[PDB]
Each structure stands twice: as C-alpha cells, then as structure tokens.
DNA sequence: ATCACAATCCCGGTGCCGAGGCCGCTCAATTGGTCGTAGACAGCTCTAGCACCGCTTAAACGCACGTACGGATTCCGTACGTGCGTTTAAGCGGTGCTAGAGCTGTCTACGACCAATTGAGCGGCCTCGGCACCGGG
DNA sequence: CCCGGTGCCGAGGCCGCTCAATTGGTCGTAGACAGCTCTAGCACCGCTTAAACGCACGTACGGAATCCGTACGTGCGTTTAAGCGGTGCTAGAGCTGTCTACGACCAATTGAGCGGCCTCGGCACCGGGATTGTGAT
C-alpha cells in the first residue's frame, strides 16, 4: 500500500472550483508540492524545538515555522486559518 | 467524529498527527493542536494554489488543471513565486521577449 | 524570397517559449547519461522515470542558464551571446 | 563520443527558448561541457543513492533525491 | 534620518575592499537601499525567534540562527 | 603640490583596505540604523551587543561580496567604474529578487 | 578504556554517541559505530583546515591562529572552500586586484 | 549553567599537528562552530538517509554514505578512508 | 633616461591585555546484564529492463549567399578623483541605575499507550466525456 | 491563428477489503509559574583627537560617431538515425518468512571537562633609517 494525498486536494478542488477536475500528472505535482511544504514546516519545528530547549512541539512552534517560511501576506493569513482552526478544534 | 471533522479541515489531522510523530521529533511529544495547526496550513496553501490554477485554466477554457496551468499560476503570483522554487514537469517557460530584441 | 536575422528567430522564440514539449532527442540524451555513469560503477541500469527525469531537469537548468547569459549579453549592449556571457553568468551564480 | 548526441539544433532550440536572438559558433561547445558537468554532479549522486539500497536499478526517486539535495528539486516524478 | 549614517566614505572603503577602482555618483544610494533590504530581512527573523523565547533581549544566537536560515551562516557568534 | 594622477591613489587604498580585516562603519550609525528597523518589527526590544556586532559583520560581508560582483559586471562591459545598473544586474543574475 | 581511546581518536565517541541519539527520528537508534565514523570524519576535517591555516601563519611569522589565517586557509582550496561556505568573523578578504585597473 | 563545547579536541588535534603553533580564542570560537555545522549537517543528512531506505537504525553505513554526498571528492576518499580505518580498529576491541 | 618626493616596507623597543596552564568538583561517560525487536539471510514470482529486426520518415547536415552586427578609431565633455582648511559627531571613561535574563521548587495540565471498534482510504473496473491531430480558410 | 470531425484513452464514480483513526482508562512527566538574585542593557556627562563635509581644480573616462570586414542567419537538397511496432527473454525489485544479534533501559560509579584564578610572553603601537613607485623634466 502507498499512502498518498489525492484526497484532500480533490475535495479542496471541488470545494474552491465546484466545476474543474484533475488530471494525473497535476495529481503527482500536487503530492509533492504538499510534502514539500510538510516537510519543510516540520523541518523548522524540530530546529525551533532543539532551539529553546522545548521537548514537546506544540502549536506555537507550527506557528513561528509558518512566520519563518511563509513570506508576508501569506504567512498572515496561514497563521490566520490556523488559529481560526485551534480555537474552533479546542471548543 | 473525526479529528479533521472537529477541526473543520478536509486533510486529515490524525495521519498529519502520525507523520509529525514519526518526522519530526526525536524523542517527545507532539501537541494535538500541532496537527490541527499544520493540516490548516497545508489546507489554505493548496487552496491557494488550487484557486490560481483554476482561474488561468478557465482563461484557457479548460476543464482539467494541467502542469502548464499549475506553472503560469505559481510563476503568476509573487508569493507563491517566491515560495515555491521547485521545477515542474511539463511546466514549459513563461512567454518574455525582451525589448533591446 | 528569403528572410533577415532576427525574423526566423523571434518567430521560432515564440514557437518554442509557448510548448511544454522536450527539446533533445532521446535516444541520444539516454546513451549520453549511460555512458556518463558508465564510469562510477560499471554494469549498471536504469528506469525509463529515471532517464525521463533526468532530462527535465538538464533542459530546466540550461534554459535558465540561458536566460542569464542573455541577460549578460544584453547589458554590453549587445545582441549575440559569447562564452564570455556565459562564463560571467556561471561565476556570479557560483556554479564554478 | 556520445556527447555530440546533443546536436546544434538542439543547443539553438534551448537557446531561443530562453529569449536568445543571435548565438556565436562558441556558444556550442560552451554549452555542451556546461551539461556534461551538470549531468556528471546529478548522476554521481543518484548513483551514490542507489549504491546506499543495495540495487543495480537507478528509480527515478533517486535522480529525485538527487537534484533535491543540490537545490534542484523537482516535482512530478516521483 | 538614520539611513544617512552610513556615510560615503564608508560605502568608498567597502567598495575598496571589493577591489572598485572608480565610483560613480549613484552607488551610494543603491548600496543603502540594498543594505536597508538586507538588514530589514535578517531583523524579521530575529525578532521572531526572540519573540518565540517570550523574551525582550535578542541575544546573538537569534541573529545567528536567522541569518543560517538565508543560507549565509556566520562563523564566530555562536557554537 | 605633488598631486597624485587621478587613479593613482585609489588603488593604494584598494591595496590598504584588502590588507586589513577590522570594521569599515563607525560603530554608533550602525547601531543606531539597527534599532530604528527593528523598532517596527516589534516595540521595546532590547539587544545583546553581540547580536549588533553580528549583524554588522554579516552587512559588511554581503555588501563586500556584492561589490565584487558589481566590480566583474562593470569590467564585462568595458569599464572601470561600477554603476547602478551593474549592481542591479550582479542582484538579479544571483537571485536575490 | 573510553570509547574513542579504543577508536584511537582525539575527539569524544561517548558525547558524540549521546548527540546523535539526540537528532535521530521517534524510536531512532544509533550504532555504537556509527559514532565512530562521525568522531574519525570531525577530526579529520579539523586537522585539515588545522594544518591549512598554521601554513598561512607560519607565511606571515606568527604562533597565534586568528580568523584572519582561517580565512586565508579556507579560500585558499577549492575543497575547502566549497564545503564551508561561510562568513568568517574578522576574517576579511583575500588581497586580489584586477588587471583592467592596474595603470 | 554548565556550557560544553569542542574546544579540548580542538586543541588536541591542533597540538597533533602544529605541536608549536597556538590559536586564538576568536578562531577557538570559529572552529567550535565549524565543528558543530560540519556534525549538524552530516547527522542530518545520515538520518533523512535511514528515512528513506525505511530504517530506524542509523549505522556506518549511512554515515559513510552522508560523507560521500556532502564531502567533495579528494576530501570523500580521505575522509572515508580515515572512517574506515577507525570502524575497524574499534570492532577489533 | 635621471631624479626629488611622498608613501611603503622593514626592523626595534615597550608594556599590556590575552592565551595557556593548573587545581576543585560535579556531571556524565562507562561497565554489566536482561529481554525484545529491528534487521539480515533465504525463496518466490512476475515486472519491467535489455536486445534484435524492419519501415519510414522527420530532423540533422553540408554548401551557397549576402547582410547586419560586433570591433577598432576619433573626439570631446564632464563627472569622478586629489588636496586642504574646518567642523561635527564618534570614541572612551566614569557614574548611576535597574529591566529582564536565568535558576529553582511545585505542581498541574496535556500527551503516550493499550483493548476494541469501526469507518475512511487504497486497488479494480466500467464507462463516457475532455482532447489532440487532423484538414481547411 | 480560428472553427469543425473524430476516435480515443484518461478521469471519475461504484465496490469490496483492510488497517489505522477514535474512545477510554490509566499514568509518568514536562512546562506554566511565582519568586528571588544579579548581570548587563540603557542613560548621562566630559574631553579629545579624528573622520566627514564642503570647496577648488585639472585630468582620465564614459559615450556618441564612422567604417569596413566578416560570420552568423536563411534556403535548398540529401542523408540518417530516432521513433514506433513487434517479439524474446531473463535479471533482479518487491513481498514473505525466520531467526538472531546488536542497541535501549537501569543501577552504581569514577574520571573527564567546565568554571575560576594567575602569569608571563606574543601582538600592537610606534620611532627611525631604507628603499620604491610617481610625476615632471
């Protein structure tokens, strides 16, 4: 069995296109844009983590790597979206 | 109900949970807001990108997103531009002639 | 009835910057990178993902390398490109 | 030697992709080691990759992890 | 005006030691805006790190640990 | 008046300045510039002397490496004197925006 | 008795053992020589840029190694200077001029 | 508030090879941060490289395929070389 | 060519901080022995990579021809470079003060784990609808 | 470049199996925290040489202009080997099982590496002849 993201990308396209498929290639393109941004974002919560001598990764260390590797605007409204997502997950 | 569903997010926040243990500490915790926070970012950024492409296949009249259409999308915006430096294939160039030409 | 420099070759800038198409032929790209791995380690083999990707990236790599050296070119008022261009481009990068 | 397989057509069409109007004769042999140094960097290190699994077949995962690890990383292959 | 500061005889001498013989009449104002550019990008990133310590003094590791993240680590700060 | 050619006497600075390794900014502009862009990111910081020292060392670097770039743009076109437009094209050609 | 004297090297097995165990994944283990390799690669590395940079002194007639001699040693070989890639602190420059301005 | 660092080896190695040539405590400083980048960049590239073979244990052989992919080549078949000679002098005690 | 002349290198004394040595001691490398689990060794099968044949036929290739373009030459105009009289803002040095880093001793909230359930997530498959090459204006 | 014709393979929805996400009870443990101490960041003055700033001035330099010679681009006819297809064949990538051989955990313990204290010797700051490129003759 291989582990994929095909789902969660074909959802979030029929979310923000209620009318526009994928294609296969695109489908490989997108897996491994996503990994790559995992990859990275987890990456930088490790070293921030080794940093401060935290042992646990909690949000603030997913929220300062976002600060570190989005640039500008977007890192804003990540950091946005993510804490709508906590504070609707907590209650 | 499901931790994504909880959080309101379609990735799944459990196998982003698992991954993050599994990458990313060495021996430690990972917090359960952790995942809900990292699966949020993956979300808003392949929303991001999925939007854009969509708009430049719609101004090519086409019902598929294409490795063309993701590279004119990500080149297109400066954020995105700035954020991915990645190759794609089949992406093709961006159209630019110089002047002095 | 011919042409002038400088037709045929925006027409063909055109041709080439608007496809997503590779530009070298493949049979000889695949013996070129087998016989460049023919020394780390000898019997070896490939994939077809393997070679196929392999050139993506070199055609990604020289055209970028060619953007450059465009660049430098241009900026000694100038419109052919020289190796000097493109040894200017590859130092500056630090690809040497 | 296999390193003429890239032909002067070849050499120009990659050229005038990338916004060139006019191309000096030099320009040929320039580009031609320009590739072989390129190619002999990414090879080495999917091969070292390759080496590390105990295998006598180069994926494509490994040309991936490769190219990634110069800064060249690229997506749709693997 | 804070950016007047670094002086013209200062850009000279680091133009100097690039080894720049003569010095047109425009490059001090390029140089300040790139040095403006550079050092605004290594201050958000120590600001942040500092910031994710709950601290208020940005010790030289925060500077050290943002300028590895642009890829220009810098030897003799920190280890 | 012995009144030096012009061109003789930069490259004796240009021979003092690579033979020497201290700082080339006066220490208070410099740290002064540092707390007024910092001032913006975040109110009521304070600094480590180290962090400024590091700061100025990494400034100083870059701008002595950008500076050779600019030096081999202008010599390319047949110059001697660095211009706006070579530091433009020595930042794009490196990929720095 | 101690790990590296077995080894035979100067630089610790047993500190460099514990900080590896310290940056492998969840459930992560080291090799006892593994910490071996890493201790016999450290130290070869350092006597390298060691003996470069007490060449570059004894050039200039002195017994203290500065930032000044690491620099010179560093961009003094293309190995050296294309693994370390980075900004020695007080290091300066290496003295080259142009032949394009040389009167 | 105990602080370790690499400056005792340091010394040692440097002793080794310019028995009488010394160093300053700034270079001290460059060389403890070269030493701790140089071991960061080689265990990281030793542990995404158990990742992939899906490993969990990270042996010689992973280092000495991480020295081979971050060291140029002269300074990889020194270095291997030196590895080696140490792996096997420790299994034989 | 030959040479005055500012500037650079070359030695020399000096006293002043810093490198290198030396103890005290606390922390952490090291020894020994369970048990357990990840990983090496042996088999199996079938996927997919190497090899050979023949067509054909789209791309490379070698020669002919002429024109646009990069390089040398010439001429000034001016914008950088040199030197100097003068001022302004850095550089120490000492005193005064204290915000905030840094350690500690509690403890209380979060996260890893296990038994069990079950519900979402991959491999098949069965099609029809976006599409790519036509062919022409 | 801009509309049709057409036969298609590619994308997508339905289906059954499986494996890991979700409760739920422990439970050991890490970081929030309040308090205390004390360093080092910040502020203010005073002199004191020194780098900056503005100005006069004459030379090298960037930039436009002119002019030939040539070497890149364009066109044509003729190879020429890349791309398809078809069939053979087997070499090892990938999955399964088994058995063990190193690496983790725990307890006691002992030496190695930090922190502080101290001293001479190397590096720095400079005075005085030696000699060396510069610029006008």
Redesign the pocket.
């Known amino acids: 069995?291989?582990?994929?993201?095909?789902?969660?990308v074909?959802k979030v396209?029929?979310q923000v296109h209620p009318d526009?498929?994928?294609?296969?290639?695109?489908?490989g393109i997108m897996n491994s844009f996503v990994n790559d941004i995992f990859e990275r974002i987890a990456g930088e919560a490790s070293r921030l983590?080794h940093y401060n001598?935290?042992?646990?990764?909690?949000?603030?260390e997913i929220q300062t790597a976002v600060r570190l590797l989005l640039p500008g605007e977007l890192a804003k409204h990540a950091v946005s979206e993510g804490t709508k997502a906590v504070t609707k997950y907590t209650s | 109900?499901?931790?994504?569903?909880?959080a309101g997010l379609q990735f799944?926040?459990?196998?982003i949970?698992?991954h993050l243990?599994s990458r990313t500490?060495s021996?430690?915790?990972?917090?359960?807001?952790?995942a809900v926070y990292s699966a949020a970012i993956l979300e808003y950024l392949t929303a991001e990108v999925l939007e854009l492409a969509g708009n430049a296949?719609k101004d090519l009249?086409?019902?598929?997103i294409?490795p063309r259409h993701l590279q004119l999308a990500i080149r297109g915006d400066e954020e995105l531009d700035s954020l991915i430096k990645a190759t794609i294939a089949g992406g093709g160039v961006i159209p630019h002639i110089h002047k002095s030409l | 009835?011919?042409?002038?420099?400088?037709?045929?070759?925006?027409?063909?800038i055109?041709?080439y910057q608007?496809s997503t198409e590779?530009?070298?032929?493949?049979?000889?790209?695949?013996?070129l990178v087998?016989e460049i791995a023919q020394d780390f380690k000898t019997?070896?083999?490939?994939?077809?993902?393997?070679?196929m990707a392999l050139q993506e990236a070199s055609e990604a790599y020289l055209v970028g390398l060619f953007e450059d050296t465009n660049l430098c070119?241009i900026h000694?008022?100038?419109?052919?490109i020289?190796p000097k261009d493109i040894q200017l481009a590859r130092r500056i990068r630090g690809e040497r | 030697d296999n390193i003429?397989?890239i032909?002067?057509?070849?050499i120009?069409?990659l050229?005038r992709r990338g916004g060139?109007?006019?191309?000096?004769?030099?320009?040929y042999e320039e580009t031609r080691g320009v590739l072989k140094v390129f190619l002999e960097n990414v090879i080495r290190d999917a091969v070292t990759y390759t080496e590390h699994?105990?295998?006598?077949?180069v994926?494509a995962m490994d040309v991936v992890y490769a190219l990634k690890r110069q800064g060249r990383t690229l997506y749709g292959f693997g």
């Open positions: 069995r291989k582990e994929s993201y095909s789902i969660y074909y396209l029929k526009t498929g994928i294609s296969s290639k695109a489908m983590a001598k935290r042992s646990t990764i909690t949000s603030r | 109900v499901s931790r994504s569903q909880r799944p926040v459990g196998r949970h698992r243990k500490t021996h430690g915790r990972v917090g359960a807001t952790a296949s009249k086409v019902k598929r294409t | 009835h011919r042409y002038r420099p400088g037709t045929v070759a925006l027409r063909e055109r041709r608007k590779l530009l070298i032929r493949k049979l000889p790209f695949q013996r087998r019997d070896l083999r490939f994939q077809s993902s393997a070679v070119a000694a008022k100038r419109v052919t020289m | 003429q397989g032909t002067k057509p070849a120009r069409r050229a060139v109007k006019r191309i000096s004769g030099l320009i699994a105990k295998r006598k077949t994926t």
